[PDB]
Amino acid sequence: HSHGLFKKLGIPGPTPLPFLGNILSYHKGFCMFDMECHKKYGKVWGFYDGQQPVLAITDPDMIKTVLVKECYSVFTNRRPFGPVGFMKSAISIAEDEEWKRLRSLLSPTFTSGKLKEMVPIIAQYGDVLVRNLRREAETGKPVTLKDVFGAYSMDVITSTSFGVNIDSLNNPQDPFVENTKKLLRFDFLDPFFLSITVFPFLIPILEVLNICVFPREVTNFLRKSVKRMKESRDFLQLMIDSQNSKALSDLELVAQSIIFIFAGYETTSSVLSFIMYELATHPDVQQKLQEEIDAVLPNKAPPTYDTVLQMEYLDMVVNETLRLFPIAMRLERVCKKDVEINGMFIPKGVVVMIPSYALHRDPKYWTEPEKFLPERFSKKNKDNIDPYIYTPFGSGPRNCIGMRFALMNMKLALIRVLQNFSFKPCKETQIPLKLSLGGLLQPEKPVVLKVESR
Numbered sequence: 378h379s380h381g382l383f384k385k386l387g388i389p390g391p392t393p394l395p396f397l398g399n400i401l402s403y404h405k406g407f408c409m410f411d412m413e414c415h416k417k418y419g420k421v422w423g424f425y426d427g428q429q430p431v432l433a434i435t436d437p438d439m440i441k442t443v444l445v446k447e448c449y450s451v452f453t454n455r456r457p458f459g460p461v462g463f464m465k466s467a468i469s470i471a472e473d474e475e476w477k478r479l480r481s482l483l484s485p486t487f488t489s490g491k492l493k494e495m496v497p498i499i500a501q502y503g504d505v506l507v508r509n510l511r512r513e514a515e516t517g518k519p520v521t522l523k524d525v526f527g528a529y530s531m532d533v534i535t536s537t538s539f540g541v542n543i544d545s546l547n548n549p550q551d552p553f554v555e556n557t558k559k560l561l562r563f564d565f566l567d568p569f570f571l572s573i574t575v576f577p578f579l580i581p582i583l584e585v586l587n588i589c590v591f592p593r594e595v596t597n598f599l600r601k602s603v604k605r606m607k608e609s610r611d612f613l614q615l616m617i618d619s620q621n622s623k624a625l626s627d628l629e630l631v632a633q634s635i636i637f638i639f640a641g642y643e644t645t646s647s648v649l650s651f652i653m654y655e656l657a658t659h660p661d662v663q664q665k666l667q668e669e670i671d672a673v674l675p676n677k678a679p680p681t682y683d684t685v686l687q688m689e690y691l692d693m694v695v696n697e698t699l700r701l702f703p704i705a706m707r708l709e710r711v712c713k714k715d716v717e718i719n720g721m722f723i724p725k726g727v728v729v730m731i732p733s734y735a736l737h738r739d740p741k742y743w744t745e746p747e748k749f750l751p752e753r754f755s756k757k758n759k760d761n762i763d764p765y766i767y768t769p770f771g772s773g774p775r776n777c778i779g780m781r782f783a784l785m786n787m788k789l790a791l792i793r794v795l796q797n798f799s800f801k802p803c804k805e806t807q808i809p810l811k812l813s814l815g816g817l818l819q820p821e822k823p824v825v826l827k828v829e830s831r
């Protein structure tokens with residue numbers, strides 16, 4: 378509404394400009410902005426994404442109330458996105474009862490057991506990753522990990538979310554890979570998304586203008602790939618089985634499968650790149666992990682679902698990387714009605730934000746927060762960690778529904794990569810690594826390392 382909201386409410390924060398709000402402070406990035414507001418304004422602060430008031434919180438008792446306790450009542454949705462079109466039936470886009478329906482219809486799909494049946498599919502794609510990484514190893518040149526890791530995550534998310542085993546997509550150009558690489562190029566963030574927050578009044582203009590985020594041609598191609606696969610009779614196989622049992626629509630099923638591709642693409646690759654950078658800069662950790670990988674899996678044994686859940690240091694290396702690098706950076710909930718959370722009034726429409734990046738590097742909960750130290754997640758130090766400060770996958774009923782799949786997908790990759798390759802930085806390697814100023818938290822310069830046969 379007005380810019381005097383947090384002023385009248387007595388909530389500290391940066392002074393906004395008349396129409397821009399606090400967007401000019403974003404030239405440093407979402408992460409550096411949140412940490413600056415944390416050190417300056419203390420626990421709770423407020424800013425304006427143009428005209429939208431945003432209230433940031435830090436108290437874990439208050440974060441739990443927003444994410445867990447009062448989720449279904451008030452903080453059920455996130456800030457409405459831009460021109461969604463038919464993707465309104467996406468679980469990340471859906472709101473209120475429509476989302477609660479889609480969340481339940483897809484909840485049995487991401488279960489331990491249903492994920493256990495997908496591991497033989499994901500592991501087979503780790504083999505293609507090992508062969509393609511050894512290819513750039515023979516050239517004796519520093520490997521750009523974004524290519525190999527970006528290919529693996531794309532190959533896994535496509536076969537799991539569409540059944541089609543596209544196998545090597547580093548070079549082959551299946552009509553699926555053609556439309557997939559085209560559709561996965563429709564999310565450059567900066568186009569519209571940033572300016573949408575300044576002018577949310579332009580969102581309804583673009584929706585009626587028939588201009589959508591994903592080109593309908595690729596969408597039409599994705600529909601045939603579902604119908605032709607449906608005409609033949611693993612994410613699509615589990616949602617089709619849900620159809621044969623408020624039911625689940627066929628158009629809705631397409632939108633949900635598209636979300637899984639966007640969700641698990643740059644996220645899985647970035648983390649896999651963030652991890653290998655830390656394994657290279659801290660080779661004492663990489664060696665200790667390879668010893669555990671070879672102990673649980675001798676002679677480059679295949680990674681089993683149960684063995685991955687037994688490798689403990691692998692779990693510690695992934696968790697410590699996700700602390701230093703929360704890909705989402707923030708969690709956001711829209712206040713649906715005037716409420717008082719743990720002794721603070723939040724009016725209707727205000728977006729409540731949790732600076733995950735700032736909390737993951739807050740010196741109160743962490744010691745030497747900037748140094749990569751996997752032992753923070755040891756068995757002796759696993760209990761004193763607040764699950765509402767460390768939220769790389771969010772929390773509450775609206776958390777990352779693809780968390781178990783993502784961690785398994787990435788751990789299966791690291792096994793076959795570490796049990797066959799060693800990683801050391803080159804001259805082009807960025808020390809210290811710089812973070813991207815975009816909206817996904819990526820390595821500023823792509824991770825450039827060297828690989829060995831071992």
Ligand code: HEM
Nearest residue numbers: 468469640641644705769770771772775776777778779783
């Ligand atoms: C390791 C990589 C990943 C990270 C760090 C991650 C992190 C997150 C976070 C922080 C959220 C928001 C939680 C909240 O709002 O409280 C989220 C939401 C979501 N993630 Fe992920 N995610 C990852 C991979 C995936 C994958 C592979 C999938 C698909 C299987 C996926 C599907 C989703 C969906 C559908 C939502 C929205 C849930 C809803 O709106 O109800 N994510 N993710």
Ligand SMILES: Clc1ccccc1C(c1ccccc1)(c1ccccc1)n1ccnc1
Nearest residue numbers: 455469636639640641644704705777816817
């Ligand atoms: Cl789930 C999703 C779908 C499409 C695009 C982005 C996301 C999302 C994300 C990830 C990193 C940076 C911004 C958004 C996302 C996060 C929070 C709320 C909505 C979407 N995501 C992908 C995997 N897990 C979460």
